[PDB]
Amino acid sequence: EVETFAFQAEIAQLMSLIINTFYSNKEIFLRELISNSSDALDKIRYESLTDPSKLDSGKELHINLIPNKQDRTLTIVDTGIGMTKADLINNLGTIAKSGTKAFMEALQAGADISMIGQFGVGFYSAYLVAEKVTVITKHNDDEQYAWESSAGGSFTVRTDTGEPMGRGTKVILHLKEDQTEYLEERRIKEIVKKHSQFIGYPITLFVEK
Ligand SMILES: CCCN(C)S(=O)(=O)c1cc(-c2n[nH]c(=O)n2-c2ccccc2F)c(O)cc1O
Numbered sequence: 001e002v003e004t005f006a007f008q009a010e011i012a013q014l015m016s017l018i019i020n021t022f023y024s025n026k027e028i029f030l031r032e033l034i035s036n037s038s039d040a041l042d043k044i045r046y047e048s049l050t051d052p053s054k055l056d057s058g059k060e061l062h063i064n065l066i067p068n069k070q071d072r073t074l075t076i077v078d079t080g081i082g083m084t085k086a087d088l089i090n091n092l093g094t095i096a097k098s099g100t101k102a103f104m105e106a107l108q109a110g111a112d113i114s115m116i117g118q119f120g121v122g123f124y125s126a127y128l129v130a131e132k133v134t135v136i137t138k139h140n141d142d143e144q145y146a147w148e149s150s151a152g153g154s155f156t157v158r159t160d161t162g163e164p165m166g167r168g169t170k171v172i173l174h175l176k177e178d179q180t181e182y183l184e185e186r187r188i189k190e191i192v193k194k195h196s197q198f199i200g201y202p203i204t205l206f207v208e209k
Pocket of ligand 1: 033041082083123168169
């Protein structure tokens with residue numbers, strides 16, 4: 001069963017700003033999502049130092065980048081801590097409130113959209129390139145869930161029926177028709193090169209056959 005929720009007013013406002021502002025430096029989305037994946041990997045690695053059984057769901061700690069030209073999707077997979085149902089519906093939105101409000105105030109004061117990460121709301125930059133975002137996630141303490149939004153003020157959460165992922169998060173970006181450059185190997189490599197040194201986990205780019 002699928003449940004539909006409204007985004008918090010400030011998040012809905014930020015999403016409409018990101019979608020409707022003319023902004024050509026769209027490549028920032030990839031650095032933001034990789035940074036988030038790295039933070040989720042730090043979380044599970046840290047927890048595993050006091051409880052090694054936290055890695056029973058998978059010991060490999062990495063990030064995979066999977067472009068798919070046929071489906072027009074860019075998938076970012078990590079084996080981080082994952083997210084609970086409470087994270088998806090409430091708690092991430094609550095933690096984001098101050099940063100979202102502060103980021104929109106900064107933008108009105110002439111700040112650049114590339115500053116989004118400095119406000120802890122980097123995820124929403126995915127809407128610069130994606131018409132729809134699907135997030136499949138699995139936390140040790142909960143079931144596997146699918147979160148999805150095409151913006152427009154709402155998102156859905158459902159228990160995922162698909163392939164079990166063990167632990168971690170898969171972000172599926174359904175790219176806008178004019179944003180297919182982010183499916184090119186050379187383009188992905190170029191973007192990641194301005195970021196991989198700060199990432200303490202292997203980033204593997206899957207080459208299409
Ligand atoms: C509903 C959208 C969720 N995203 C796709 S996300 O927030 O960008 C994002 C989240 C995680 C994630 N898993 N576990 C966890 O704690 N995090 C996390 C990391 C950083 C900040 C807040 C967070 F919860 C991830 O592994 C990759 C992501 O792209």
